[PDB]
């Protein structure tokens, strides 16, 4: 069961579009984004016991 | 260029001070990169020996 | 009211121009350390353009660091050094570009953090001789070089 | 009084490319102290000519 | 630190799963209006599933409206009508679907809003006799139909 | 020179004072001599 999200659009949503802070005018910048997805590949299951 | 990159190969933080040699302006910058463990520990070295 | 909510605004941005100066007077700007004890978030809030006179410490553990002057701190009065013109990333940079010789209009200099927008502040006019200012026409003519 | 000037400089900062994504650590280079005294296994160097 | 800001979280959605109940017991739920005095925000804030208990005004001016019961007032104890399951939109809807008969695990009922999440609230178990709750295994059995 | 901007390192008011080192009596008479010190570099405009 995953969180029901569209990841490509959610990366576009996170940027606060107003974003006039310290300089008192909108700056220039450059954005990169990346979708990590963690797992747990060491909680394996007993493959052997149904051979017996 | 070579001193900035050697600062992070050496420690992992660029820390220039208001009393540096070639900082006449005296700016204060503690640019920290957070390299996790910059040095591996050895309680005894390779050349350490006895007997 | 409860099921069909009306139009309510949720966010406005407010863009301005930067603080103008005279062409025929010349700019002269230096960078400086900033005192961390000053809540520099407070002085850089309002997007309407304001400038504010900045002093420098004479000696001590924060010598060279700069801080906005208060008109009762006589140590800040005798050590006024310039004026930050515009906005600046206070959280992304501990070093501000203080302007020293410039000519800025009387409406764009504020000294309270609870300042009005674009209004001529009265306390900086009533002590404009000890902060080394000379309001000639409608402009603050200052030079902290000499 | 005629003079002549040259100004020079740049903008930049070294960027660390990789970062771990599960935790936010960084491990690509590390230091180590392996030998306590190894200058004895080294030839001497000539001095500087202070002319 | 100063010119390089490291990775640092912004927000945290913690999607949970809604409170289960016995299939073989049935359900009987009715819509109620909500008492506007009590802050229904700070009951529905948390992402973890909870199920608190509500009580009706049997008489009085706001009769028919429901408020979450407080375990010291006897009038809320003698007029409990059901529990509210997993969640509800409080701000866009002034009414609530109160389940009058269900079978909820004891891990999922928290009477106070600032209670430990997914834990058996001890003050509910200590007073479940007056509240007509009959704990059997790990579950609350209740119907306030009569 | 009437108006210029010279470092503290290169102002030596005595001929036997050591070079490449800031002379101290110039700094302790910086207000009488109307030299404003803001950095290493001095500032002076004796024309104004």
Swiss-Prot record, chain A:
Naturally occurring in which organism (per UniProt): Thermus virus P23-45 (Thermus thermophilus phage P23-45)
Family that this chain belongs to: Belongs to the lambda phage major capsid protein family.
Localisation: Virion; Host cytoplasm
Leader sequence segment: none
Name this polypeptide is given: Major capsid protein
Shown chain mapped onto the complete sequence: 1 to 52 of 409
Functional summary from the UniProt entry: Assembles to form an icosahedric capsid shell with a T=7 symmetry although with a diameter of about 82 nm, which is a larger volume than the usual T=7 capsids. A dramatic reconfiguration of the capsid shell that expands the procaspid from a diameter of 66 nm to a supersized capsid of 82 nm, allows packaging of the large viral DNA genome. The capsid decoration protein binds the expanded capsid and stabilizes it.
Assembly and interaction partners: Homomultimer. Interacts with the portal protein. Interacts with the decoration protein.
UniProtKB/Swiss-Prot annotation, chains C, E:
Location of this chain's protein in the cell: Virion
GO cellular component: viral capsid, decoration
UniProt keywords, alphabetically: Capsid decoration protein, Capsid protein, Virion
Quaternary structure and partners: Homotrimer. Interacts with the major capsid protein.
Known role: Cooperatively binds the expanded capsid, thereby stabilizing the mature capsid shell and allowing the large viral DNA to be packaged. Trimers of capsid decoration proteins molecules are located at local and icosahedral threefold axes and stabilize the expanded capsid, which shows increased spacing between capsomers.
Protein name, UniProt field: Decoration protein
The species this protein was found in: Thermus virus P23-45
